Design a protein around this ligand. Structure first.
Ligand SMILES: O=c1cc(N2CCOCC2)oc2c(-c3cccc4c3sc3ccccc34)cccc12
Ligand SMILES: [Cl-]
Ligand SMILES: [Cl-]
Ligand SMILES: [Cl-]
Length: 127
């Protein structure tokens, strides 16, 4: 089953702005998760061809990954922190929906999510 185009990271018709929270999401949150030992599966879109998961896009209708998020942050795609936090949450929940509890990929997602929650609890107030 072929992979879809990845989620867009540019769109001149979409509104965007810089906020101190979005800066924090890039410089602190993404940076911290990206370097984790278990980050590598989440640094690019799921490749359902390489992994022989022909049902992946029958089950996961909103794919998301940190490569995409990183590009969205670096390219000033977002309007607010909520848009970016939603992408992270979609990434994690996709993994929990598709896989069995306790599978390695779920444990890896859970480790990143634990760090994510700590950093989101520490989200700065809007300037
Ligand atoms: O929900 C997911 C489910 C699964 N799998 C099902 C269980 O068996 C391992 C693959 O994998 C992933 C992966 C992932 C795991 C292992 C290798 C690779 C990926 S994504 C990718 C892209 C290019 C090359 C290799 C890999 C990442 C995020 C979510 C899932
Ligand atoms: Cl497909
Ligand atoms: Cl493909
Ligand atoms: Cl470690």
């Amino acid at each position: 089953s072929m992979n879809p185009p990845p989620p867009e990271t540019s769109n001149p018709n979409k509104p965007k702005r810089q906020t101190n929270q979005l800066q924090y999401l890039l410089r602190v949150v993404l940076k911290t998760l990206w370097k984790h030992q278990f980050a590598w599966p989440f640094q690019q879109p799921v490749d359902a061809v390489k992994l022989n998961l022909p049902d992946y896009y029958k089950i996961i209708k909103t794919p998301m990954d940190m490569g995409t998020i990183k590009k969205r942050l670096e390219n000033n795609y977002y309007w607010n922190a909520q848009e970016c936090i939603q992408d992270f949450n979609t990434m994690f929940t996709n993994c929990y929906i598709y896989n069995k509890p306790g599978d390695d990929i779920v444990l890896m997602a859970e480790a990143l999510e634990k760090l994510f929650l700590q950093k989101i609890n520490e989200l700065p107030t809007e300037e």
